[PDB]
Design a protein around this ligand. Structure first.
Ligand SMILES: *[C@@H]1O[C@H](CO)[C@@H](O[C@@H]2O[C@H](CO)[C@@H](O)[C@H](O)[C@H]2NC(C)=O)[C@H](O)[C@H]1NC(C)=O
Ligand SMILES: *[C@@H]1O[C@H](CO)[C@@H](O[C@@H]2O[C@H](CO)[C@@H](O)[C@H](O)[C@H]2NC(C)=O)[C@H](O)[C@H]1NC(C)=O
Ligand SMILES: CC(C)CCC[C@@H](C)[C@H]1CC[C@H]2[C@@H]3CC=C4C[C@@H](O)CC[C@]4(C)[C@H]3CC[C@]12C
Ligand SMILES: CC(C)CCC[C@@H](C)[C@H]1CC[C@H]2[C@@H]3CC=C4C[C@@H](O)CC[C@]4(C)[C@H]3CC[C@]12C
Ligand SMILES: CC(C)CCC[C@@H](C)[C@H]1CC[C@H]2[C@@H]3CC=C4C[C@@H](O)CC[C@]4(C)[C@H]3CC[C@]12C
Ligand SMILES: C[C@]12CC[C@H](O)C[C@H]1CC[C@@H]1[C@@H]2CC[C@]2(C)[C@@](O)(c3ccoc3)CC[C@]12O
Ligand SMILES: *[C@@H]1O[C@H](CO)[C@@H](O)[C@H](O)[C@H]1NC(C)=O
Ligand SMILES: [Mg+2]
Ligand SMILES: [Mg+2]
Ligand code: NA
Lengths: 291, 996, 32
């Protein structure tokens, strides 16, 4: 009963040739109309959104805190001797900072020299297109001392006492608000509380906090945070080649051949946290410089 | 080697009854008048086994539970669960941080099968439980003569070769060989199907041990008289025992509904493995390794298995079975409720099933006029003219001159179903007088019986003389009855409206043709007459001692004839007419005499009026039957005597060329041969019987129907459906409900099969376009086992779109439950629109949150990564892992809601297959609740506190609740114009391609 | 701030509807 393939009375795979053509033509016209309808409705959907601002922005309420070595498990395990052991890290650091070189930020028509001192926020009008392409404040690698250098094509980084810069998640229209001068026990930090978003690293328990001896932070003018003169963000369409602020963190006194946990928590009023997302506001890393 | 045993059982039995008393006693070594010594009896008792049928094969409850856990549908879900754990094994040991989706789904599928097994098992067990409350097996002791003494012992304590005596009323224990009878009439109705009480004569009469009279039978009751006999067969070696063992040893077959379920699974898994394999090859062509491609294969195949359709179908069948149980139509099998609708040939039993199996007064002859009495079981027929004096005279002759009276508890029972002591004929007459002529209680004692003359062996006649209480005449009233020829030979006067007339041949021949009218109609006629004796010659003191001629044998006054026969049940003719109206071929299968079977067939509808048999045409032309052509005879009667010498091809020809067939004098084994012959044509067969002879026929038939009270226990166990009320019209109800639920199953199946397209397409384009997952696993479970459950069940409550009893029975090889048109609609058109609507909601949410649809291409590579917490959107914003994951889950939730919105219109269009939704109408309250519950539950799964933590179903911004709205309206409009074109153009295209 | 959404209002309303529509359905299958 399963040899209905053909017969001398015209049937193929179950039906005739003229029937195959009728059904195929119907399905082509039907699916063509379905595709056209889906395309028209998706076009209306495209007409309900703007080019300069996402309609819903509440799912990115607490900005994240990422790092340069996008590790497979946020762990930095390498050998201070073997250059190939830490190649995966250095490669990503150079590729990340490749857009921050002095040669990359050379056009004066899209770049603006903010300043050597973190200042107040810079609002470049509204988010509409009435104004031209906004300017992006420059950020030279020299600001991250001891983690930038004047190296060649390959940034000779730190083998012993590694460097891990932190970055604040780029959010459209987000205006960072650092904590008030009434700081609720925020781990010794400089008195530049009004024009910089503080970020402080620490261990995780009584063991990690003891293994990690000394940490040295580097930023704009020497402050451990992000300057407010670089915010807010005006989208990729209006601000292409935008350079968000960076801040490096070096762990000088580490216990070699020991995996220790570090939590770099960014503080501020507009900076939230989450017990489910260890990256919202805070940031974790597992460093282990095994020799 | 059981094959040979079953074969030796399918052969008609043999005997050694035709033996001289000396030869019989020598063969059994038994005294003819003293039986045998108790020691010999006990030795045989402990030699071959007590006289009782071996109990049925006990069925443990754990066995039938494991039976409900397997099957065909549950087996598919089982292989699906096993494939889930297989894919989970391939995912756990090979990749890092494996996901527990497949494990969750595997245990869920296992739970689905187990829960369905528990529910269906509880239903079938409930039916068996209420069936067990019907075994009213009352122990019955027999009268045995042993060592020369009369002893009453348990039936099981009786053995072979010993004298047994039976009294009128006692049930024949074992199979005896009559040696000395005295007016003994036994009831062979439950075994061979002989209607009238066949008498038992010690002399050998017929070569057939069944038609003969020197054999008493197991399960038969002695109607009247007394008789003696030597036990020949005991226990399972008996006649009805060899029939019962055959019923237990036959095969049940495969129900049509189960076969349709199997074919449905063939198509489902066919397209499932086609998509899985083609997509597996495509995935390997792209980039995914064999490790991931195998998971894609198992995923696309398993996802194409309707997990919830098992429970919905089981509940559907259960619901229709519930309606069957409400009308006292119990079904021991959960799927046997459907078999009636697909039936195209019903093989009924005459005695007991079609007929009431009870002698009833049929017609009366008064004033040279035929008067039909009411023969309905519930007394709902036309009443005869009961006002003339001739009726009073006839009723007095019948109520007075008849050896029949009621019994002890007979008071609250109706006039017909009550018990009467005496002959079946006298019982019918007593019931008729007690029902139409007031009461025979005071009417009998009103005429004091002086001298009676009972029936005679030769020249049978029953007369008696009674006093006269009328206040106008002191003469004696003599009454007599008997065979019409005997009364015609002993009569001279004729009664008419009160006065008498001579035996003029003008009205006497008018009596003769009426005699042949009632006799040819298949009834048994009796003549009634009375006469007033002259009190001047027979004074009030002259006692007419019963010896000499004290009453004038001749010169009597004939009043009229009274015929009688077992009438068909009340709704039997109408029901047969409905079955033939639906296109079901009715074939009477009985072992009764043809003279009565043909008449009953004409009276119920199995033989239409005007259609002639081969013998009828031969008689109408006064020519031998060997001349007429059987093709000129639409109907035909097949004598069992001729059926024995027949081949398979011959019986096939009998069924193919004759539309109205009546099998008469057929053995139980021949009933089985007849059912097998009807099955060779490829048709669905239903057999309705009551006696033990219907046991092998009810077991082999596609569906057996037994009578709840008038049916023997053996055939009642071998049947698949029981009629507790004995209402044959339940057969009509059954074929209706069977066709109805068949169509409702089609609708429900198309509904659950429509949701598969938007359930799998997200995972398909997840592999092709490399976009984030549009729909998750748990969300799909919320549709297959959550929301759509009530709409699918409500689809079983759908009524008839047209008259289902007007269409012909479905073709088994053509009209399948799930044809290619259904897949062309669910998997082809409707489900496609549902999938497009789901993807629309997907892009709506992602684009509104910053991820334009064009940007989503190739994004899953980094989207599903748990550590790239800076995935750039279309606006340059950086999204962490849990942020975009929250968006993905709050993207799965509205996709699920979208499924509900499109299922609104899909349910409304599946509710009607041909009629417009405006024609049929939203009157299904279960369907309205199905929409309210579905919508409210969908909203609850998204807005309940903690859903994003338990089921990862986040709340929906209200605008999402309107993304799928146009797609639903589109589905409704498209299917509505489809059914409109099918309505106006019933010719080709829209009907042959989409109408399923 | 535009980075805040009153999810509790929509959630509460969705549950009120999920309750009313359900009790209405119960009234539908109970024609009295
Ligand atoms: C950057 O690294 C240089 C080493 O190349 C550090 O310079 C040393 O600083 C200490 C004081 O902390 C002096 O005692 C050493 O003599 C310096 N050595 C050299 C070679 O210059 C410098 O301190 C580091 N900068 C920071 C901010 O930690
Ligand atoms: C850097 O860490 C080292 C430990 O690795 C500190 O030196 C140790 O001091 C303890 C006493 O507290 C001694 O018992 C160890 O022998 C010392 N080890 C070494 C290698 O010197 C050191 O004081 C830390 N320096 C700074 C600037 O934090
Ligand atoms: C992921 C993408 C590329 C897969 C594309 C699958 C499309 C092209 C397939 C899926 C289901 C298919 C249909 C399945 C059912 C029917 C009815 C059948 O009697 C003829 C073929 C016909 C008319 C098919 C046409 C092609 C079809 C629409
Ligand atoms: C097609 C018509 C007749 C069917 C009626 C059902 C429609 C109108 C109902 C079904 C579910 C309903 C939604 C249920 C949930 C939500 C969330 C709530 O906080 C605001 C209302 C909102 C957004 C409702 C809008 C109206 C809605 C879409
Ligand atoms: C021939 C006619 C009836 C079809 C007209 C199409 C209508 C019914 C379709 C076309 C585009 C659709 C809209 C597309 C855009 C939006 C915004 C989105 O965030 C929610 C869905 C919503 C609100 C849709 C509602 C239904 C809609 C207006
Ligand atoms: C874990 C999973 C692994 C592969 C991808 O990383 C996507 C994720 C999430 C969806 C999930 C697959 C595994 C197979 C499923 C369980 C699937 O069979 C299925 C079965 C029934 O519905 C769907 C198809 C999609 C699926 O849900
Ligand atoms: C915060 O308080 C300190 C003294 O407690 C003061 O020196 C500093 O200027 C204050 N900063 C601001 C921004 O008020
Ligand atoms: Mg499903
Ligand atoms: Mg019968
Ligand atoms: Na059966």
């Amino acid at each position: 009963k399963k040899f209905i393939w053909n017969s001398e009375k015209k049937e193929f795979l179950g039906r005739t040739g003229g029937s195959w053509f009728k059904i195929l033509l119907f399905y082509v016209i039907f699916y063509g109309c379905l595709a056209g309808i889906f395309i028209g409705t998706i076009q209306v959907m495209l007409l309900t959104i703007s080019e300069f601002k996402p309609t819903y922005q509440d799912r990115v309420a607490p900005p994240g805190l990422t790092q340069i070595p996008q590790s497979q498990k946020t762990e930095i395990s390498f050998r201070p001797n073997d250059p190939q052991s830490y190649e995966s890290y250095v490669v990503s650091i150079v590729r990340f900072l490749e857009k921050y070189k002095d040669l990359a930020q050379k056009d004066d028509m899209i770049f603006e020299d903010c300043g050597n001192v973190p200042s107040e926020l810079k609002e470049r009008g509204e988010y509409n297109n009435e104004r031209g392409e906004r300017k992006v404040c420059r950020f030279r690698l020299e600001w991250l001392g001891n983690c930038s250098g004047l190296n060649d094509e390959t940034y000779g980084y730190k083998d012993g006492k590694p460097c891990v810069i932190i970055k604040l998640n780029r959010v459209l229209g987000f205006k960072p608000k650092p904590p008030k001068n009434e700081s609720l026990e925020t781990y010794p930090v400089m008195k530049y509380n009004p024009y910089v978003l503080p970020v402080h690293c620490t261990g995780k328990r009584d063991e990690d906090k003891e293994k990690v001896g000394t940490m040295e932070y580097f930023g704009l003018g020497g402050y451990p945070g992000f300057p407010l003169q670089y915010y807010p963000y005006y989208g990729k369409l209006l601000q292409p080649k935008y350079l968000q602020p960076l801040m490096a963190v070096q762990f000088t006194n580490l216990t070699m051949d020991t995996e220790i946990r570090i939590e770099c928590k960014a503080y501020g009023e507009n900076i939230g946290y989450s017990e489910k997302d260890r990256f919202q506001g805070r940031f974790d890393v597992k460093i282990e410089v095994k020799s | 080697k059981e094959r040979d045993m079953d074969e030796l059982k399918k052969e008609v039995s043999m005997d050694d009854h035709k033996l001289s008393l000396d030869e019989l006693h020598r063969k059994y070594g038994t005294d003819l008048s003293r039986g045998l010594t108790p020691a010999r009896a006990a030795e045989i008792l402990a030699r071959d086994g007590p006289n009782a049928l071996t109990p049925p094969p006990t069925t443990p409850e754990w066995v039938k539970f494991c039976r409900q856990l397997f099957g065909g549908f549950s087996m598919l879900l089982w292989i699906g669960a096993i494939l889930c754990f297989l894919a989970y094994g391939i995912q756990a040991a090979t990749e890092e941080e494996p996901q527990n989706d497949n494990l969750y789904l595997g245990v869920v599928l296992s739970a689905v099968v187990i829960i369905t097994g528990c529910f269906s098992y509880y239903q079938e067990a409930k039916s068996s439980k209420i069936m067990e409350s019907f075994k009213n097996m009352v122990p019955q002791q027999a009268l045995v003569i042993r060592n020369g003494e009369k002893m009453s012992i348990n039936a099981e304590e009786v053995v072979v070769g010993d004298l047994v005596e039976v009294k009128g009323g006692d049930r024949i224990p074992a199979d005896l060989r009559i040696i000395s009878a005295n007016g003994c009439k036994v009831d062979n109705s439950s075994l061979t199907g002989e209607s009238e009480p066949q008498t038992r004569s010690p002399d050998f009469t017929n070569e057939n041990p069944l038609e003969t009279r020197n054999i008493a039978f197991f399960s038969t009751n002695c109607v009247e008289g007394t008789a003696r006999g030597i036990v020949v067969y005991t226990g399972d070696r008996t006649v009805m025992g060899r029939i019962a063992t055959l019923a237990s040893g036959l095969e049940g077959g495969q129900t049509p509904i189960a076969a349709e379920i199997e074919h449905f699974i063939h198509i489902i898994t066919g397209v499932a493995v086609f998509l899985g394999v083609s997509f597996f090859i495509l995935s390997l062509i792209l980039e995914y390794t064999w490790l991931e491609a195998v998971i894609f294969l198992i995923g696309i195949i398993v996802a194409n298995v309707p997990e919830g359709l098992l429970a919905t179908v089981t509940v559907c069948l259960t619901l229709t079975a519930k309606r069957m149980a409400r009308k006292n139509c119990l079904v021991k099998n959960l799927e046997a409720v459907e078999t009636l609708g697909s039936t195209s040939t019903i093989c009924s039993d005459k005695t007991g099933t079609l007929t009431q199996n009870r002698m009833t007064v049929a017609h009366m002859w008064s004033d040279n006029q035929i008067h039909e009495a009411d023969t309905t079981e519930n007394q709902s027929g036309v009443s005869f003219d009961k006002t003339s004096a001739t009726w009073l005279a006839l009723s007095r002759i019948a109520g007075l001159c008849n050896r029949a009276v009621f019994q002890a508890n007979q008071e609250n029972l109706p006039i017909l179903k009550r018990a009467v002591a005496g002959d079946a004929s006298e019982s019918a007459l007593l019931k008729c007088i007690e029902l139409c002529c007031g009461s025979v209680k005071e009417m009998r004692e009103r005429y004091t019986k002086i001298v009676e003359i009972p029936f005679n062996s030769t020249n049978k006649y029953q007369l008696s003389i009674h006093k006269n209480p009328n206040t106008a005449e002191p003469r004696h009233l003599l009454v007599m009855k008997g065979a019409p020829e005997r009364i015609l030979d002993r009569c001279s006067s004729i009664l008419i409206h009160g006065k008498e007339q001579p035996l003029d041949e003008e009205l006497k021949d008018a009596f003769q043709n009426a005699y042949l009218e009632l006799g040819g109609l298949g009834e048994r006629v009796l003549g009634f007459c009375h006469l007033f004796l002259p009190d001047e010659q027979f004074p009030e003191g002259f006692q007419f001692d019963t010896d000499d001629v004290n009453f004038p044998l001749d010169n009597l006054c004939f009043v009229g004839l009274i015929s009688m026969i077992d009438p068909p049940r009340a709704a039997v003719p109408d029901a047969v007419g409905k079955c033939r109206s639906a296109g079901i071929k009715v074939i009477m299968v009985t072992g009764d005499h043809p003279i009565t079977a043909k008449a009953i067939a004409k009276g119920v509808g199995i033989i239409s009026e005007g259609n002639e048999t081969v013998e009828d045409i031969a008689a109408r032309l006064n020519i031998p039957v060997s001349q007429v052509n059987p093709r000129d005879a639409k109907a035909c009667v097949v004598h069992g005597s001729d059926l024995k010498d027949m081949t398979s091809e011959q019986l096939d020809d009998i069924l193919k060329y004759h539309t109205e067939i009546v099998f008469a004098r057929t053995s139980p084994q021949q009933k089985l041969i007849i059912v097998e012959g009807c099955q060779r044509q490829g048709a669905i067969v239903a057999v309705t019987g009551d006696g033990v002879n219907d046991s092998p026929a009810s077991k082999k038939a596609d569906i057996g129907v037994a009578m709840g009270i008038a049916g023997s226990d053996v055939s009642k166990q071998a049947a698949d459906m029981i009629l507790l009320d004995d209402n044959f019209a339940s057969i009509v109800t059954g074929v209706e409900e069977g066709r109805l639920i068949f169509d409702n199953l089609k609708k429900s199946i198309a509904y659950t099969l429509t949701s598969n397209i938007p359930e799998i397409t997200p995972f398909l384009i997840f592999i092709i376009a490399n976009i984030p997952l549009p729909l998750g696993t748990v969300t799909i479970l919320c549709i297959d086992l959550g929301t759509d459950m009530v709409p699918a069940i409500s689809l079983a409550y759908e009524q008839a779109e047209s008259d289902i009893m007007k269409r012909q029975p479905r073709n088994p090889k053509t009209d399948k439950l799930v044809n290619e048109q259904l897949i062309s609609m669910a998997y082809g058109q409707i489900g496609m629109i549902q999938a497009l609507g789901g993807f629309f909601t997907y892009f709506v949410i992602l684009a509104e949150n910053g991820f334009l649809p064009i940007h989503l291409l190739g994004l899953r590579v980094n989207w599903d990564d748990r550590w790239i917490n800076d995935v750039e959107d279309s606006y340059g914003q950086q999204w962490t892992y849990e942020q975009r994951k929250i968006v993905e889950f709050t993207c799965h939730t509205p996709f699920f809601v979208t499924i509900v919105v499109v299922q609104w219109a899909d349910l409304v269009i599946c509710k009607t297959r041909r009629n417009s939704v405006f024609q049929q109408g939203m009157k299904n309250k279960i369907l309205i609740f199905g929409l309210f519950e579905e919508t409210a539950l969908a909203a609850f799964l998204s807005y309940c506190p903690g859903m994003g933590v338990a089921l990862r179903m986040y709340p929906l911004k209200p605008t999402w609740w309107f993304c799928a709205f146009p797609y639903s309206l589109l589905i409704f409009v498209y299917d509505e114009v489809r059914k409109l074109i099918i309505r106006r153009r019933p010719g080709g295209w829209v009907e042959k391609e989409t109408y399923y | 701030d535009p980075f805040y959404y009153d999810y509790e209002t929509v959630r509460n309303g969705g549950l009120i509807f999920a309750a009313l529509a359900f009790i209405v359905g119960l009234i539908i299958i109970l024609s009295k």
